[PDB]
């Protein structure tokens, strides 16, 4: 994912899950501040996010909260952790139907990002 190729977060996450469903994996929890722009209307990503090869991520909780929700409504978690959990849901068999970013205000370390999941 090259830098600033998507003019907003809505079109950025539409291709992020497309690559993840295609077998590509990402992990940027250690350099999160260097790849995430500010404000969801900014071009995404700020810097190119490299592909990882060693993607092994086993969370300490149930990533799929419900059968149609990544997190409980109002749950706050690290922005990088959102993408690791979103990838986990896609790997385990859940498809993304919509990512909740319409009224959110923060993107850096903690953000209230949520997704609607679907079968297959």
């Amino acid at each position: 994912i090259k830098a600033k190729t998507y003019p907003d977060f809505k079109e950025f996450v539409k291709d992020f899950v497309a690559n993840v469903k295609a077998g590509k994996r990402y992990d940027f929890r250690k350099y999160q501040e260097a790849v995430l722009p500010l404000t969801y209307s900014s071009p995404w990503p700020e810097s190119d996010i490299p592909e990882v090869t060693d993607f092994n991520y086993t969370p300490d909780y149930t990533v799929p909260f419900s059968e149609e929700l990544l997190y409980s409504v109002g749950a706050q978690m690290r922005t990088a952790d959102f993408f690791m959990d979103l990838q986990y849901a896609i790997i385990n068999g859940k498809d993304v139907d919509t990512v909740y970013c319409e009224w959110l205000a923060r993107v850096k370390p903690f953000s209230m990002l949520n997704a609607k999941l679907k079968d297959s």
């Binding site: 600033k4 500010l38 900014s42 071009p43």
Partner: protein, 105 residues
Amino acid sequence: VTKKTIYFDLDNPNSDIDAHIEDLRMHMEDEAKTGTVINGEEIHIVVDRTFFSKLIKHPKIRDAYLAQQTPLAWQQITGSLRTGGTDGVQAHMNRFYYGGVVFVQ
């Protein structure tokens, strides 16, 4: 002599406006050939309407200015602009401040 044209490429989101402004400064600092030291900040940039709109619209400048809690940052974004003298028909002319230079519409 040869005329110098500087292409800002304001439409491209990945373009670096800082490099273009530095080119504009160094052209006056180097091609003056006056034998004295030259400050390239004083260059009297006069800008057309579309150029000014594209410049203030650019994501790099907007994002550099959204994350600054200064009155200038509050003014250039979600602000009146229109800080200048009269040209003959309007009380004030648009002026934008960035990188030590002033773009006047």
